[PDB]
Amino acid sequence: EEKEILWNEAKAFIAACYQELGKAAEVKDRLADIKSEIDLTGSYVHTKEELEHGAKMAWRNSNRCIGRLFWNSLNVIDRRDVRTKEEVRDALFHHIETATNNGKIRPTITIFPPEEKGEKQVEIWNHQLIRYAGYESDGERIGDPASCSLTAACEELGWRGERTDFDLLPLIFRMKGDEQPVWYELPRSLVIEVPITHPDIEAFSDLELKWYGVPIISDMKLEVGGIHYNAAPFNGWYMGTEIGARNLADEKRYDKLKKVASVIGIAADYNTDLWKDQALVELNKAVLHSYKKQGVSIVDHHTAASQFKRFEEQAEEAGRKLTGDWTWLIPPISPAATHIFHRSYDNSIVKPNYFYQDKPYE
Amino acid sequence: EEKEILWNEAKAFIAACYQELGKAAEVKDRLADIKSEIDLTGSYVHTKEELEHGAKMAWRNSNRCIGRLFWNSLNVIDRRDVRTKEEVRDALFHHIETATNNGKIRPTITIFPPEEKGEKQVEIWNHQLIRYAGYESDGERIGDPASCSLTAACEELGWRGERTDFDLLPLIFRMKGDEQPVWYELPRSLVIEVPITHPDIEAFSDLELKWYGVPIISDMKLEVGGIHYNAAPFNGWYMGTEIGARNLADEKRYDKLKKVASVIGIAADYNTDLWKDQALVELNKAVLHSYKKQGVSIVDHHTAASQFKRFEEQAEEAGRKLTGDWTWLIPPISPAATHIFHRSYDNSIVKPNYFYQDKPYE
Ligand code: HEM
Ligand code: HEM
Ligand SMILES: Cc1cc(N)nc(-c2ccc(CNCCc3cccc(F)c3)cc2)c1
Ligand SMILES: Cc1cc(N)nc(-c2ccc(CNCCc3cccc(F)c3)cc2)c1
Ligand SMILES: C[C@H](O)[C@H](O)[C@H]1CNc2nc(N)[nH]c(=O)c2N1
Ligand SMILES: C[C@H](O)[C@H](O)[C@H]1CNc2nc(N)[nH]c(=O)c2N1
Ligand SMILES: [Cl-]
Ligand SMILES: [Cl-]
């Protein structure tokens, strides 16, 4: 049954992949090879070409992602050769370094060995490779609430956070055959952070806000032709709203809107004053300004939506159906100022793709 | 077949209606009466109690409406007795007067005779009872683009607009048995309008913006227990974003964001400056300020969302399933600042309800 799922997925992927690569004539023989390989081993191994194009197709098919125009320029690093925790750690360090690229962020994915019998070879615990710790105890809240459960798990492994609002979590992952994950502190020289200042309002720096440069999602599964790459961290650059409208603004995250209102000199007393809306706009302006000033890549939601429009056009020109999740594609600030708000999207799931998977802790 | 649809809908409605009204014991005899009445006449007539509660249930079931907390205080005016165009006109004038209530807006619905064989008795052409005309010809655009087709239809009936940006469309409706609709100019004394000024920025008045006080939707069908009330205009007060984030801001509406940016003294040159977002916030502040200053009811999106939360709670307490359309319930400005953004809603259709219907022109 599982083999059949594998073979059916493989047939669909190879046909589509080789079509797009102008290799349609090679489909027949390649499928035969794979079919034999499944029969004998219970699985099959992707060529480097298949793996690279598969990761790109998976991004192209990610319904919730506004950044998909650039799917074909994804930098794919094949690390299916890793066998040791030192190799995994060094690969993750390298990913951070090469993706960061001194601020000129390169969209990158590092692909580790795939699941075998649904058995993971490498199990990454981090949500993102760079993320802040969170703490809550007897009433006191410190750091990023979204990291509370992982932070607590880490402190079960012998790690201890300094309990600033911006402690960098260590890398945490488990190797097949080990009962507990290992953790490694991030070399600070690898991690770019951006202090948040405002172009016009000098007092904004009093909030002492910062965010990290590069979002590197490390807890999703890349599925390509029936092969499950549960460990395959990927990154892009931020859209400013992710930081200014959500990470720093959500009541269940850093919850900074009242403090923002104060430093920009407006009252936070009356709903009809739209002080939350004004604070959100200024915080989002500050985020974009700060990343730009520091030479770290970022995109604003207007430019991002314009690029997404081009992605829609390119899909139509290539004769590919477009899929999207409207509820995630609209930016959380001024959504109706984008073309996305005013059309609809088919939210069908197409593979290859990136999927959520169960967490190994909690 | 149609009778069966009618009888099935009637059974569902009467049972539910009488339950909610504590009249469950009367359901049996009432259903018998209706069943006979359908047999003989092909239809049935609602009691005043049924009609009133039906209109209220229909609002309660309107998935796209954030304002539903107040469903049970809807003022229902029964005008099933009208037979002449003079009576219709006067009823519509009266609706405007009593709903407006000198600025302290009363949510009101006026219900006209229902369709018989799918044959309308009264056919209202207006989208809203008070709405601005729109014009486009050899390149020149005047007024509200969304009203262009109705405006053109009106000018086929002997009416002529002054071609300001805010011409009030006349009431336009057709009686059963007449081939053409009639039109009547709105008495200006009945129509409250609000000039848009800003609490802090004196130059905002240079834009010479205004909007009308009361949104009165006049082109939707109220369906209650299988009876189709195609003519049943209803009103509430505005949520500020409808005016400031959409009517005045949409590129395909009044398209005022660039002019707003200019009068508030910011550049409209760079996406990363978030000038559209800032302009939207100031325009929305001005809308709320202006309606408040003039003593015309309005609600901001934060307060409206808070009321909607109470509506959700009240549904749960009453043991009623909640339905909603997330994509319409989120406000078009700072949606993630509302609780609505962070939950999901079942978009199932429950009757009684209000529905779109085909336009009689174009
Ligand atoms: C290059 C710059 C990129 C930008 C600006 C961008 C933008 C975004 C944004 C704003 C989200 C929504 C996240 C949230 O609200 O939680 C998102 C989701 C997503 N992006 Fe992208 N993205 C980029 C690159 C990539 C890359 C390189 C991949 C993978 C190869 C990717 C795959 C996804 C996926 C899978 C999601 C969905 C996450 C989820 O369901 O929680 N994106 N993207
Ligand atoms: C009392 C104040 C009210 C407020 C603030 C309010 C708010 C809103 C808003 C903002 C919308 C979205 C409109 C759009 O974006 O196009 C809406 C939709 C709707 N409202 Fe309400 N509403 C109110 C009263 C009412 C009343 C009295 C009824 C009927 C009895 C009603 C029925 C609806 C319906 C049917 C829609 C959907 C319109 C469509 O699908 O195009 N509302 N409401
Ligand atoms: C590659 C990339 C670029 C970019 N600019 N953003 C992202 C990105 C950001 C955040 C997320 C996380 N989305 C939410 C996951 C989630 C889902 C449900 C509950 C939760 F607490 C968290 C995924 C991708 C990814
Ligand atoms: C009662 C009430 C109160 C309030 N504050 N707003 C409304 C209201 C406002 C606008 C609308 C119109 N919604 C869009 C109709 C539509 C749908 C599709 C295309 C179009 F051009 C227009 C409906 C109800 C209704
Ligand atoms: C295409 C999309 O459904 C459309 O733009 C909707 C989105 N959500 C909305 N929500 C409201 N309240 N009003 C609208 O006009 C719309 N437009
Ligand atoms: C409940 C709802 O689905 C949830 O709040 C979603 C809405 N749309 C979103 N869109 C993005 N981009 N990111 C998010 O976290 C969410 N949250
Ligand atoms: Cl993030
Ligand atoms: Cl409107």
PDB file of N, CA, C and O in Angstrom, chain B residues 166 194-197 204-211 248 254 256 260 283:
ATOM      1  N   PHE B 166     -20.736  64.077  -6.436  1.00  0.00           N
ATOM      2  CA  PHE B 166     -21.658  63.589  -5.418  1.00  0.00           C
ATOM      3  C   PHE B 166     -23.121  63.867  -5.781  1.00  0.00           C
ATOM      4  O   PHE B 166     -23.884  64.345  -4.939  1.00  0.00           O
ATOM      5  N   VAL B 194     -22.162  64.086   5.454  1.00  0.00           N
ATOM      6  CA  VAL B 194     -21.117  64.477   6.386  1.00  0.00           C
ATOM      7  C   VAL B 194     -19.881  64.941   5.622  1.00  0.00           C
ATOM      8  O   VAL B 194     -19.276  64.161   4.897  1.00  0.00           O
ATOM      9  N   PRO B 195     -19.498  66.218   5.785  1.00  0.00           N
ATOM     10  CA  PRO B 195     -18.245  66.663   5.163  1.00  0.00           C
ATOM     11  C   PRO B 195     -17.080  66.058   5.918  1.00  0.00           C
ATOM     12  O   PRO B 195     -17.140  65.975   7.151  1.00  0.00           O
ATOM     13  N   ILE B 196     -16.046  65.634   5.205  1.00  0.00           N
ATOM     14  CA  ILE B 196     -14.932  64.956   5.848  1.00  0.00           C
ATOM     15  C   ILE B 196     -13.867  65.968   6.227  1.00  0.00           C
ATOM     16  O   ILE B 196     -13.272  66.611   5.357  1.00  0.00           O
ATOM     17  N   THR B 197     -13.631  66.115   7.528  1.00  0.00           N
ATOM     18  CA  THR B 197     -12.505  66.904   8.030  1.00  0.00           C
ATOM     19  C   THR B 197     -11.643  66.046   8.953  1.00  0.00           C
ATOM     20  O   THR B 197     -12.047  64.953   9.352  1.00  0.00           O
ATOM     21  N   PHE B 204      -7.176  69.124   5.396  1.00  0.00           N
ATOM     22  CA  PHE B 204      -7.918  67.960   4.921  1.00  0.00           C
ATOM     23  C   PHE B 204      -9.211  68.394   4.222  1.00  0.00           C
ATOM     24  O   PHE B 204      -9.677  67.732   3.293  1.00  0.00           O
ATOM     25  N   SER B 205      -9.787  69.514   4.656  1.00  0.00           N
ATOM     26  CA  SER B 205     -11.030  70.000   4.065  1.00  0.00           C
ATOM     27  C   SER B 205     -10.838  70.465   2.621  1.00  0.00           C
ATOM     28  O   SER B 205     -11.817  70.611   1.889  1.00  0.00           O
ATOM     29  N   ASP B 206      -9.585  70.682   2.214  1.00  0.00           N
ATOM     30  CA  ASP B 206      -9.294  71.093   0.835  1.00  0.00           C
ATOM     31  C   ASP B 206      -9.677  70.014  -0.172  1.00  0.00           C
ATOM     32  O   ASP B 206      -9.901  70.310  -1.353  1.00  0.00           O
ATOM     33  N   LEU B 207      -9.740  68.766   0.292  1.00  0.00           N
ATOM     34  CA  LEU B 207     -10.119  67.650  -0.570  1.00  0.00           C
ATOM     35  C   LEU B 207     -11.605  67.682  -0.903  1.00  0.00           C
ATOM     36  O   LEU B 207     -12.051  67.030  -1.854  1.00  0.00           O
ATOM     37  N   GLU B 208     -12.366  68.439  -0.116  1.00  0.00           N
ATOM     38  CA  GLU B 208     -13.808  68.582  -0.319  1.00  0.00           C
ATOM     39  C   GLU B 208     -14.511  67.230  -0.436  1.00  0.00           C
ATOM     40  O   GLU B 208     -15.372  67.034  -1.299  1.00  0.00           O
ATOM     41  N   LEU B 209     -14.149  66.306   0.452  1.00  0.00           N
ATOM     42  CA  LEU B 209     -14.774  64.990   0.494  1.00  0.00           C
ATOM     43  C   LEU B 209     -16.015  65.045   1.377  1.00  0.00           C
ATOM     44  O   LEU B 209     -16.074  65.821   2.340  1.00  0.00           O
ATOM     45  N   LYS B 210     -16.996  64.212   1.054  1.00  0.00           N
ATOM     46  CA  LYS B 210     -18.143  64.005   1.937  1.00  0.00           C
ATOM     47  C   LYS B 210     -18.655  62.598   1.689  1.00  0.00           C
ATOM     48  O   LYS B 210     -18.236  61.951   0.730  1.00  0.00           O
ATOM     49  N   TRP B 211     -19.518  62.104   2.569  1.00  0.00           N
ATOM     50  CA  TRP B 211     -20.223  60.852   2.324  1.00  0.00           C
ATOM     51  C   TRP B 211     -21.626  60.980   2.913  1.00  0.00           C
ATOM     52  O   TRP B 211     -21.903  61.898   3.698  1.00  0.00           O
ATOM     53  N   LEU B 248     -13.912  55.580  -0.444  1.00  0.00           N
ATOM     54  CA  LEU B 248     -13.103  56.741  -0.800  1.00  0.00           C
ATOM     55  C   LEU B 248     -11.694  56.368  -1.256  1.00  0.00           C
ATOM     56  O   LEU B 248     -11.005  57.185  -1.873  1.00  0.00           O
ATOM     57  N   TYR B 254     -13.552  56.136  -5.417  1.00  0.00           N
ATOM     58  CA  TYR B 254     -13.135  57.540  -5.453  1.00  0.00           C
ATOM     59  C   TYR B 254     -11.613  57.754  -5.515  1.00  0.00           C
ATOM     60  O   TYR B 254     -11.159  58.843  -5.874  1.00  0.00           O
ATOM     61  N   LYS B 256      -8.862  58.215  -3.613  1.00  0.00           N
ATOM     62  CA  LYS B 256      -8.357  59.458  -3.030  1.00  0.00           C
ATOM     63  C   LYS B 256      -7.014  59.371  -2.288  1.00  0.00           C
ATOM     64  O   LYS B 256      -6.556  60.376  -1.747  1.00  0.00           O
ATOM     65  N   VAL B 260      -4.933  62.378  -0.485  1.00  0.00           N
ATOM     66  CA  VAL B 260      -4.811  62.341   0.967  1.00  0.00           C
ATOM     67  C   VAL B 260      -3.345  62.472   1.384  1.00  0.00           C
ATOM     68  O   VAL B 260      -3.009  63.261   2.270  1.00  0.00           O
ATOM     69  N   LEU B 283      -7.134  59.055   6.646  1.00  0.00           N
ATOM     70  CA  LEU B 283      -8.471  59.175   6.050  1.00  0.00           C
ATOM     71  C   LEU B 283      -9.539  58.498   6.917  1.00  0.00           C
ATOM     72  O   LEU B 283     -10.645  59.029   7.114  1.00  0.00           O
TER      73      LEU B 283
END
